[PDB]
Design a protein around this ligand. Sequence first.
Ligand SMILES: Nc1ncnc2c1ncn2[C@@H]1O[C@H](COP(=O)(O)OP(=O)(O)O)[C@@H](O)[C@H]1O
Ligand SMILES: Nc1ncnc2c1ncn2[C@@H]1O[C@H](COP(=O)(O)OP(=O)(O)O)[C@@H](O)[C@H]1O
Ligand SMILES: [Mg+2]
Lengths: 77, 63, 526, 151, 52, 77, 52, 106, 52
Amino acid sequence: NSGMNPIQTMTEVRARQVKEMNPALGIDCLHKGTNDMKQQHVIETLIGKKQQISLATQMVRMILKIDDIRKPGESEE
Amino acid sequence: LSACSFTSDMQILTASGDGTCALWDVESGQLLQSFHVLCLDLAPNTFVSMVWDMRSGQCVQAF
Amino acid sequence: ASLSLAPVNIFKAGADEERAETARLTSFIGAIAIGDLVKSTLGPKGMDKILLSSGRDASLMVTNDGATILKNIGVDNPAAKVLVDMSRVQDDEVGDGTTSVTVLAAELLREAESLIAKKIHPQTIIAGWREATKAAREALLSSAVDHGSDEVKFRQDLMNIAGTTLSSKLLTHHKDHFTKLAVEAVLRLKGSGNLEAIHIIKKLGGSLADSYLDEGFLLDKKIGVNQPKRIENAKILIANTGMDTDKIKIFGSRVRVDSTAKVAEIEHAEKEKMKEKVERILKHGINCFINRQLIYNYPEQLFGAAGVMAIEHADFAGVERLALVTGGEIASTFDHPELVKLGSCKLIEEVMIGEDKLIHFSGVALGEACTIVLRGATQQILDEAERSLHDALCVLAQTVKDSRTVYGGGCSEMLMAHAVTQLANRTPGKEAVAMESYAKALRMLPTIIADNAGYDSADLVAQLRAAHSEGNTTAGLDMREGTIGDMAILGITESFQVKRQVLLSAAEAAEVILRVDNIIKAAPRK
Amino acid sequence: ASLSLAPVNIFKAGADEERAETARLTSFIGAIAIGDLVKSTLGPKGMDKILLSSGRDASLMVTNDGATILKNIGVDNPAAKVLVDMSRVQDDEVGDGTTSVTVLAAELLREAESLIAKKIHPQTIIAGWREATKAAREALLSSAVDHGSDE
Amino acid sequence: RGKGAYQDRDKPAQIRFSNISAAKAVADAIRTSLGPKGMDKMIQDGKGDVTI
Amino acid sequence: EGPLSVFGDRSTGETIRSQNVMAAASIANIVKSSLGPVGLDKMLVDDIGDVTITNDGATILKLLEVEHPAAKVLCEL
Amino acid sequence: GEKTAGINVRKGGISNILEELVVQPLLVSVSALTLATETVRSILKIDDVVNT
Amino acid sequence: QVKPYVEEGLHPQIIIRAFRTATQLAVNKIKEIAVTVKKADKVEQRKLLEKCAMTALSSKLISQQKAFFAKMVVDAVMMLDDLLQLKMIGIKKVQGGALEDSQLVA
Amino acid sequence: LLQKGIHPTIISESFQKALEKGIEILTDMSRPVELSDRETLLNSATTSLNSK
Ligand SMILES: Nc1ncnc2c1ncn2[C@@H]1O[C@H](COP(=O)(O)OP(=O)(O)O)[C@@H](O)[C@H]1O
Ligand SMILES: Nc1ncnc2c1ncn2[C@@H]1O[C@H](COP(=O)(O)OP(=O)(O)O)[C@@H](O)[C@H]1O
Ligand SMILES: [Mg+2]
């Protein structure tokens, strides 16, 4: 969405996160020069991320568990 | 198939909505030459659909 | 009062007319739509289009050729029809440039609608465009370089031109191999312009790199039953005779006797006439016999008993190509054996290509006729390769005819546009604005070329403009990495004829469409 | 893959969806149509329009006001609806400048269409326009003159 | 540097995705008939002709 | 219909196997009553009143109007 | 290190496939690879569909 | 299983009698071999209830949290007095939230 | 590959390189045969006929 190359930027940020232990390195969407989100003050609630992961996992589990559909197929008006 | 004007019984002129008439012969059964259609009138070695010539395989008179 | 907007109606049911603003809107919309469609297939990084026929056959066609794309589309906009006819005529005149001329015309008409919106009379635009076309044409002619005197430099120019022509097409995967292929095929013509002397055979299966130019010739016909399947030091006789129950051409003649014994005698006389004809043919001292028409069973048996190959039903193109490649004479009477020249080749045999058997002529005498075998993975790939080779051969033949060459990669467009801008800076009035719009379209051409590659077109075009204004007359786009460079060293060259024709045809069509202020449509049949 | 260009049909009957280039095309076409319609009624030498209603009473209305022109027409393009609501709100805030604001928005969107055609991400255009708006507002404020003290 | 080319046109990506989806669908359809444990298919034409 | 994009129906897996078995069983049950000395003949009206009384299996299966290919296989057998 | 190992349907696992005499000419695999790669490359160059 | 015998003209009454006999024998065998423990202590009784609840729940989308829900169900049922009305166990569904956020209120 | 933001031309060139390497690998795997070796021909035909 910010116009940068996805795979290269994500790989570089992941490599930087692995090299020096800093879980605050993200994608410089606004092109401020730095990749440290702690300095850029990009902050989200922990509850938000936990809820995102939980809800996505549960809904994906439901969608994966459905193996049959019985629609009326009437194409009613 | 639209036009199947059997001809000189040695040759067969056939045509359809394809738009390119085909010249066949009875004995050999080989397409002699496909001239690049609804009517296949012959000479009242030449025929008109555009007049075509057997000897050259090309349109000779357009009207 | 308008013709249609009047209290009384003056038209039949279904007839229509569009006045100045509406006609201009329709024409500009149609032309810009055509230009946008045909573009993005331009330059080395242009992509291909899929043409799904809606007919009964539902023919599928993938291609990069602008003329092919514009031909097989249902067009209702009349200005779009004008542009399509422009592309077709450009294809007929020279092989390449079909996409470039259409894009140039579309950009010119877009600038024209901008100028009209700026309250400029279209006649002033036309005059300014005429002056700009004159200046650009003279500048391009001054920029042309000729290498026809030097054989090695001319061969290098042919290499570069074939490579530039094949760069955009699907053959860019094996550009080097296909460039050598096309250059050899054209050079084997010995200066003749007969593009029909080069036969392209499309055989499914195999890789695209397996395509090759046969050192001799290949015929897709069959040999007789009892005739030999292999001849060394062949003596060709090419004929266009009956060889099939050839009735005496007196159509009013008939056999009228009173006994079946006489009928049998006449039948034996007919067979003896055929036998004597075959003997007269054999008196030439030949090993192979190619006839344009069919050969029936009796002459075939006689030829087999004589140990002579009798290739039958080789159509007009086939006999012409055989005559060109072997040096024979297409005869129709055999009463003067000494006055007829016989073709020659070292070996004739049958070759196995894919699953079909073909006749191979090897060690030909003249060889002024080529057979190019195309192997591909799909029918669509084979068709596109055939189209690309046709474009390359056409451009190479045009270059052989006229050896003047100009640099590609946007260099010619930059130089012509720089000349147009220089002229405009010396011109007072709105003609200067029209000239500037003309130059803007000329810049827009390589701008679209760079856009298709994903590069930063604005910076590259600005650099090209600065270099051309400074005096670097050979600067152009370097598509290898996305910079600008010298087109002379990089060997990006194209025919002067092609570029001049593109420029002139685009200017003509833009002027013709711009002159229109009213479109009147008669009631259609449907 | 998009919702419309998917092998499965994911929408109700009569509902559609327009992706990036198509949505931009429709928005720009609607905005330019609104701007071209409302203009020519601008400045001292502007001309008036005739609003002939299609209703049973067929109300006839001659007008030069941009807001009245824009509100009394059948608008289906959503961007055109946005421009119409802009004109109505402008009329509500102050009695003048409806045609001016509509034409300015249309011209801005035309230039945006040109910039998008020149391969520029719309966020860059938006940031540049925010900076330009700041500069223009500051200049206009600095150019203002007040005469309320002297009667 | 910042952002690169915007690529305002999304139709080429949709065309590529549709082509890939169709090819993958064909491959999945004929996947079941591969190998010594593969099984044949019966196809009935519009004319009513049947082939296995 | 779906990503396969073929103009026709498609049955896969246990469904087509069951359909084939059903067709074969239908053909078998047509002629099952005409087996052995305690078998009985059959009448075959030919849509215009023509009557064919037979016990031969080949005649019965040839005179019948069958449409399922798995049943045409048994008839040709 | 063993390259002649493949699916063994008779045994039900993995074994030296040459012991089951399951061999095929190299031309089949080479042609399959070359033709599939060429078709994929051709498809990747397509970015628009036009209805005639 | 009885379809092939039906097709060959077996009388339905014989099949019915055989089914009744087999069902009676199977029910008696189930009652004979069913495991019960005569100790009447609360701890292992709760363990038995929890194990039965986990087995009943290990087929649904909440199977990943079957221990948590099983413990909650056992507590909820044990808080019922003597008749175990279903209407005495309220079930409120509130949209939004993970499964582990489900709670039982005393 | 395309979803990650890779241009189709790069994908096609990489696939061509992979195809060349794969042809080399397959050629390295294979072993020569003689048409006088009847057992090899029989095994090839049988391998062809297992799936039918
Ligand atoms: N290798 C290359 N480098 C830079 N530009 C090229 C190259 N090959 C072709 N071009 C440019 O692409 C333009 C379009 O060529 P092409 O699309 O092949 O045929 P057409 O001229 O019919 O559009 C030409 O004007 C040429 O200057
Ligand atoms: N006498 C004038 N001389 C020059 N410009 C004028 C004059 N009167 C009005 N204008 C300009 O015409 C513009 C449009 O005003 P108008 O046509 O009344 O519609 P609106 O005020 O709704 O935009 C205004 O911005 C104003 O600057
Ligand atoms: Mg070209």
